[PDB]
Structure 1
Amino acid sequence: PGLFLTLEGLDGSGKTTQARRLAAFLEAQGRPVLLTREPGGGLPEVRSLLLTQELSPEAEYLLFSADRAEHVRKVILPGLAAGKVVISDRYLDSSLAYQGYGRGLPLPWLREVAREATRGLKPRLTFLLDLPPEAALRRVRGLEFFRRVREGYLALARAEPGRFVVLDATLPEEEIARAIQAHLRPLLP
């Protein structure tokens, strides 16, 4: 039993908003739900090292992967074992987009590290809230970096189009929330 779902996208794309909308929707149907996030979901103390004095991208990813390893084993898998819909605000795909396409780290190395960290656990669906960097920076707070990240997410979507549900994040919140519920309707329970 259980159903693992993730929300993905740039900063200010609406991940947390749609994650909370989905949680409350499933909760209103009386379904068990575990809303979680990355980083912090497995090892909460890793979030302090995110805001650390000029941390290298390789070390940053390995901290993410340590947290994600603990997140999978002690929170997500038990949640799935208990029949919950586990929704994670960010997952592996965040690291692949930001570290791989954004910062430039080799993808085979990232996937090699992730293979044992994640225990092979892929989301059943991943909802990619896609919008341009210019719109993303207006929502949340160089644009060349976020352009590579955006293209990375689409490259990952192109590689796994069954898993990735690509949605226009500039659409209204209701229209996006209604669409996410439509993609999940047949998967429940």
Structure 2
Amino acid sequence: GLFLTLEGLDGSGKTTQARRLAAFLEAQGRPVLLTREPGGGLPEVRSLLLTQELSPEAEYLLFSADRAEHVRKVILPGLAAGKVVISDRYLDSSLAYQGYGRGLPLPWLREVAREATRGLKPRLTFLLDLPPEAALGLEFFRRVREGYLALARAEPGRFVVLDATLPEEEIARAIQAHLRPLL
């Protein structure tokens, strides 16, 4: 299998590009599974967090419980069948939002995640970058945006950072260009 993720602020085009990427792979005859966080593991976590505000620690731990189920019940089985699995958000979302955004320490986040994810990491992560005011109270969102960019510059072999303000088809073509060597 091949594991790919989409990351970025809300309104950065993740769901759009994940859809277009799955469609590209379908056109090439490649088995593909599209999934998302939160809720790919525990739908009830997503719906709970829609209407409950918690401490950052509790928030993260719920995202992590979802992720633990998501990895085991959805992603790993898809990869085991040889599918390309695309997740619209994954662990980097917690690192950016709960870590850089709400201030939780990354080493702890990563120790929690080590068991939650079974160490599963995407081969490539497409970060759709734009300022919060361009996404289709701002201080939090700037911390998240900058946090994503920090994660990306720490792992330049995994992250591909794209200008989320470009036209959709152009972004999709850029994702395809980056992906083709790996298929």
**Shared fold per TM-score greater than 0.5:** yes
Are residues 53 and 185 of structure 1, via their aligned partners in 2, closer, same or farther at CA, if it must alter by over 3 Å? closer
Q: How far apart, CA to CA, are the structure 2 residues paired with 1:161 and 1:48?
A: 34
Superposed CA deviations along residues 108-133 of structure 1, whole A, max 9, x for unmatched, are 11111011101111100000000011
Shift of 1:52: 3.3
Comparing 75-84 with 53-62, greater Cα deviation is found at 53-62
Aligned residue number for residue 181 of structure 2: 186
Match of 1:60 in 2: 59
- 1:13-58 Cα distance to aligned partner (Å, 9 max, x none): 0000000000111111111110000001011111121123332211
Give distance in 2, aligned partners of 1:38 and 1:63.
11
Could you list the runs of 5+ residues in structure 2 that have no partner in the other structure? none
Give the deviation of 1:107 after TM superposition. Answer: 1.1
**1:83 aligned residue:** 82
How far off is 1:73 after superposition?
0.8
Q: CA RMSD in A?
A: 0.9
Distance in 2, Cα, partners of 1:52 & 1:12 = 20
Could you tell me which of 131, 143, 152 is aligned with 2:147?
A: 152
Please name the residue that 2:46 is paired with.
Answer: 47
> Secondary structure, in 3 states, of the residue corresponding to 2:23?
helix
| Map of 1:15 onto structure 2 | 14
Q: CA deviation at 1:177?
A: 0.3
Which runs of 5 or more residues in structure 1 are unaligned?
none
Equivalent residue runs for 1:33-182 within 5 Å: 33-136=32-135, 142-182=137-177
Distance in 1, Cα, partners of 2:50 & 2:31: 33
Return the alpha-carbon distance in structure 2 between the equivalents of residues 133 and 52 of structure 1.
22
When the two structures are superposed, what TM-score results if normalisation uses the length of structure 1?
A: 0.94
Q: How many aligned residue pairs are there?
A: 183
SS in 1 for 2:135: helix
State the Cα distance separating 1:11 from its structure 2 match: 0.9
Secondary structure of the residue aligned to 2:98 is helix
Q: Distance in 2 between matches of 1:187 and 1:173?
A: 22
The alignment partner of 1:86 has SS state of strand
Q: What's the TM-score, normalizing by structure 2? A: 0.97
* Cα distance between partner residues in 2 of 1:53 and 1:144: 21
CA separation in 2, counterparts of 1:29 and 1:105? 41
Measure, in 2, the Cα distance between the counterparts of 1:79 and 1:31. Answer: 13
Question: Alignment identity in percent?
Answer: 100
Deviates more, 1:25-34 or 1:44-53: 44-53
Moved more, 44-53 or 169-178: 44-53
Deviations, residues 139-176 of structure 1 (Å, cap 9, x unaligned)? xxx11110000000010001101000011101111110
